[PDB]
Design a protein around this nucleic acid. Sequence first.
DNA 1: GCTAATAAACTAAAAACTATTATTATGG
DNA 2: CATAATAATAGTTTTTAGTTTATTGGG
Lengths: 163, 489, 281, 53
Amino acid sequence: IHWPCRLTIGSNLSIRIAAYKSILQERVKKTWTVVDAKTLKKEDIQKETVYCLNDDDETEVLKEDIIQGFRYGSDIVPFSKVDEEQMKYKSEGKCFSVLGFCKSSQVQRRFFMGNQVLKVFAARDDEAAAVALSSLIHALDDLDMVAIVRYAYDKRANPQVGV
Amino acid sequence: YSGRDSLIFLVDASKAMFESQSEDELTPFDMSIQCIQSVYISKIISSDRDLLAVVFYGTEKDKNSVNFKNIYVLQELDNPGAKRILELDQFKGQQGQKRFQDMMGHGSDYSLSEVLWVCANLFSDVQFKMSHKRIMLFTNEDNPHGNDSAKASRARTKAGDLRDTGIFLDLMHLKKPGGFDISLFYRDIISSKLEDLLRKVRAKETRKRALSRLKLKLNKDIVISVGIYNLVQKALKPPPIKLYRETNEPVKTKTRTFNTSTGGLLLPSDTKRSQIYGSRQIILEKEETEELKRFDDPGLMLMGFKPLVLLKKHHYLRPSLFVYPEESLVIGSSTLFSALLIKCLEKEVAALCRYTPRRNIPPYFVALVPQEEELDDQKIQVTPPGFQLVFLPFADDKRKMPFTEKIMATPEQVGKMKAIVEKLRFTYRSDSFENPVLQQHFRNLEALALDLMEPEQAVDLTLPKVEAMNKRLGSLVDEFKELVYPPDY
Amino acid sequence: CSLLRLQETLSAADRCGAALAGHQLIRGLGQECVLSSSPAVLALQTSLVFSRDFGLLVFVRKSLNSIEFRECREEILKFLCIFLEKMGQKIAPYSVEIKNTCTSVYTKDRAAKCKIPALDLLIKLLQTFRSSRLMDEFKIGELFSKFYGELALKKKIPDTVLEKVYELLGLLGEVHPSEMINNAENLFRAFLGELKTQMTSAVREPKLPVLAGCLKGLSSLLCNFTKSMEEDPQTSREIFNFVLQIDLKRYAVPSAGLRLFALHASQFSTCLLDNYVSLFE
Amino acid sequence: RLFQCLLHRALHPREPLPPIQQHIWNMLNPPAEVTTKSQIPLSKIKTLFPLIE
DNA sequence: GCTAATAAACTAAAAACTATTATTATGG
DNA sequence: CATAATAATAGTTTTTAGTTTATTGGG
């Protein structure tokens, strides 16, 4: 689906762009639904996560009285969901902003990272800007230039630096 | 190679933490304390497999298990942790310095040979795989050989023993930085970075031991022992260890399959895998599932040779892994691969295989980028001699685009924007990317481990700007964007 | 006395967390172990109450994951089991005591961080029943009720050499009420399933250790009287001999299966008609 | 392989499952004519270097 | 006028790091 | 049957592998 964004760098550049996945596995849709061998009814199957405590009787307690610890150094630091929910901050929105330029000769295929190929599309609703972006594509190709881009996957995800 | 890097922190107590000593700052006590605190934080975030102990050569009233005179033992050898952070915060800042004055005081008499004795004891205390053992020391007293010559001779003897023992010691500028002036004669047994130590770069985890090694069963006859490794990693969320929100007690979340109907604990045996498709629930089993994934033995079966010219940007997958030649049960692996690398100018036609990761799991086509012995002049083996495992996609690895084929623009645009981009050439730096969420997370952890007022939000190099490139280049990019109604809507 | 001195200083040298202190404690444990190894009848009676008191002391007071406790009480259970060899029935009002203590011990890390203490637990209690049946072996009813509650447990996360499914955890110390019968038929179908899994003896999935090391010995103590020669499962378990491939390494496990086949040779009727010579050779 | 297993368990779920396949497994194998042209130089290298220790 | 098509996170996960004990060989 | 036999069958924390988590969506 459309990944709308404006590729904005500096005080001048802002190009409306819709990103799309090019390389992407089609995973199996219907899963290996485990069913009772003697009735084949997953509906008659329960998956309960009995949050027991470290007790002899291991008294179960919901997360109501449970916090999320973290083994910080030779100790554990517990952060509640709101505690670990306010400490956070990421690039809000479908962010995509190039950091600068460099020759692609500096990097190598052995120096790549990321799992797919993401063909970002041209300018949105601006064919003049689209062909200008095509010419900029050519300009990058001639100089081996790279669009090193800070990319927040969306509002919901963290930023991810890419090119 | 596993091993605990034991590090000892020798800090003076008489004046080397308290005399300016050819400088003008305050007592080096506070700066040294903050330096070591920073490095402790750096280890906590980056390395918790390295033991640490702090010692105070010079002691008016001994705090030492050794009970030797002029020995102040604060923290024993142990991995970094919050108790030690509080321990040092007691002696942090000028308030911590006046504390130091309180319980033991400065101007403390020293016992150098006994200090070597007790730190040797501490080194002997460890019972684990050790990677490195360093004595870290700061002193305004660069050359206190003015002591009795017996003490100096015994100390040099102990130094010969410990470096002979392999114990390492570091003294670094505190009095006369640079010009080799520091350590006017304590250069005899020892043969700047304060900025880095205070900088406490952290959150760096790296391979410690070998893992994931296989063989190159290229044909049905030949195998070649190798090893598969990673240097590109996806940063994790640190483990949310469910603790009792009151009592900080862990959780035994007893999750199992069960029955919603008859109240019985089901098992994978009396249950079956299944696939609700069309008019037939396609049944399966756990070992049935494994077999459906069980294709062949792990290893590298050679499927061909392809030039390093078909590989293109769209020919890309998950980040590549590495193969190093190995000789455990295949003689000549390294030798034959050395032949391959010397004739790699012709071996741009790299190996082709459908790599099987392990047993019970299918193979997958993954190309292999020939890694040379790219050893730098400073002797850094960047891209060690081997093969990078760029993964060959399938028709699975596709999400198609539309085909609104766009045509090129006038060449003046290309030229002016080439001038723009090369004028706006960002300084290349591979080690320049730190994730703001990651960094800020580290800062929250470290800050909300003490009673810190706030965790700093690390302004990362990954953050784009508005005017830095608009002063390195300017608005001539937009003026060059001469088309009516630019994409700046 | 030496017993008293260890009961006190050992109960004193357990101060806060010093694993060095706790392993000098395991050292004094070894001393008491060799003391019991050199026993006297009066020393027998004295060590009985010392066992009660200070074993309960280490049982309750330590009760923590500290490595000192880990190893010290590991060898504590080791010593208790290796002493179980001989007390006589004198451990009868003291049997139920340590029965409950050991059940709770299982409910401890020996459910979470099961180790050598867990097998110590198991062997001690099992040899206890086979040394003493049904004078306090009635609490064991509800004990196994809970056990089967945690035996129907799907969680096979625990350690392989501490797995509990196919050779020794025999359970028939009680009168075999319908409780264990109803639980046991489910146990039996589980045995069938995971043994069928086991005999894929071409798929390089041995899983032999204590995985094939506890609960079909539970079957051994269970199959003695259950599921007579009346159905397909009979011939299935008959077939379950076939491999019992080559093993070497003393081939204990194939020989173990063969020994069980010896145990229930009586249970081998109505189908062994087949394959005279193959079986016999 | 998943598809043909689906066909098995659909038409005849009451059967043991087949192997992965031949034909689908068949179409992954490396070039046979390359093996033919290789076996002589392949023999040269393989006999040239023992691969055991 | 409607109603995914995802993708932050799932919540996990199989890796020898390490090897004591049994090995059943040979004093007993 | 002799009785300290000294190898494999794991013990390990591995990172790293498939986990629904999520919202735009046909009216």
